[PDB]
Design an enzyme around this catalytic site. Structure first.
Site, PDB file in Angstrom:
ATOM      1  N   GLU A  53       9.382  21.886  12.642  1.00 13.28           N
ATOM      2  CA  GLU A  53       9.347  21.662  14.079  1.00 13.28           C
ATOM      3  C   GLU A  53      10.623  20.967  14.548  1.00 13.28           C
ATOM      4  OE1 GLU A  53       8.862  22.500  17.146  1.00 13.28           O
ATOM      5  OE2 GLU A  53       6.727  22.706  16.677  1.00 13.28           O
TER       6      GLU A  53
ATOM      7  N   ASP B 170       4.663  23.759  11.263  1.00 11.69           N
ATOM      8  CA  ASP B 170       5.355  22.528  11.618  1.00 11.69           C
ATOM      9  C   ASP B 170       6.077  21.903  10.431  1.00 11.69           C
ATOM     10  OD1 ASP B 170       4.993  22.041  14.446  1.00 11.69           O
ATOM     11  OD2 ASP B 170       2.850  21.818  14.022  1.00 11.69           O
TER      12      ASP B 170
ATOM     13  N   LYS C 176      -6.848  26.345  16.446  1.00 12.35           N
ATOM     14  CA  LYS C 176      -5.715  26.525  15.544  1.00 12.35           C
ATOM     15  C   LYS C 176      -6.088  27.428  14.374  1.00 12.35           C
ATOM     16  CE  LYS C 176      -2.131  23.948  16.971  1.00 12.35           C
ATOM     17  NZ  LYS C 176      -1.713  24.091  18.391  1.00 12.35           N
TER      18      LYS C 176
END
Ligand SMILES: O=C(O)c1nc([C@@H]2CCCN2C(=O)COc2ccccc2)[nH]c(=O)c1O
Ligand SMILES: [Mn+2]
Ligand SMILES: [Mn+2]
Length: 176
Positions: free
Chosen positions: A61, A89, A115
């Site tokens: 990220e 991420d 998610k």
């Protein structure tokens, strides 16, 4: 929200969040809640470490998403792990799995479920944090020790309390 974000977050984090929004056609000063949400998610990614010794986690990220994919490719080629369909991420070098970090003003369980449905792959680990001191992770595996996660929960709760005193929290909670 701006004045709060500039004061509350590190200037590097503020710069990264400004870029990500302008890159996606949104301006930091109107969609102020997205500004704070991106800053907060970035900070959590930076604190996602046991804080000692080796570079256990590759932070995907906060980087140019084209370049970040080449890094994911290099990991998958060396490690043999299946390639994720969506840019995660982090990558855990110890557990050898990718991580998707979630920060929600809603509930940790309902945000994990969204998610998990989007991730589709059972290989990518999911770790959700809230502003109320709660967390939810895949198979109850929280990856970090409890003191590292306590720092994140307390920081998130601190962010929540600082917004609340400026009457900014309720709008930030409802924007999601
Ligand atoms: O944690 C999360 O919720 C999470 N969500 C995303 C979603 C998926 C679609 C693109 N996108 C983004 O937000 C891309 O950036 C944006 C999007 C809009 C405005 C400003 C920045 N991407 C993650 O990397 C991630 O960690
Ligand atoms: Mn991400
Ligand atoms: Mn994330």
């Amino acid at each position: 929200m701006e004045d709060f974000v500039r004061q509350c977050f590190n200037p590097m984090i503020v710069e990264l969040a400004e870029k990500a929004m302008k890159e996606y056609g949104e301006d930091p000063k109107i969609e102020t809640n997205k500004f704070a949400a991106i800053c907060t998610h970035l900070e959590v990614c930076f604190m996602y470490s046991d804080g000692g010794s080796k570079h256990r986690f590759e932070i995907i990220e906060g980087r140019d998403r084209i370049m970040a994919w080449t890094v994911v490719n290099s990991i998958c080629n060396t490690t043999g792990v299946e390639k994720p369909k969506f840019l995660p991420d982090l990558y855990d070098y110890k557990e050898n799995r990718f991580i998707e970090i979630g920060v929600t003003r809603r509930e940790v369980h309902i945000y994990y479920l969204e998610k998990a449905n989007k991730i589709k792959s059972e290989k990518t680990h999911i770790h959700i944090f809230s502003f109320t001191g709660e967390e939810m992770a895949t198979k109850a595996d929280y990856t970090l020790d409890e003191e590292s996660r306590a720092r994140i929960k307390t920081r998130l709760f601190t962010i929540r309390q600082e917004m609340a005193s400026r009457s900014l929290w309720d709008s930030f909670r409802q924007s999601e």
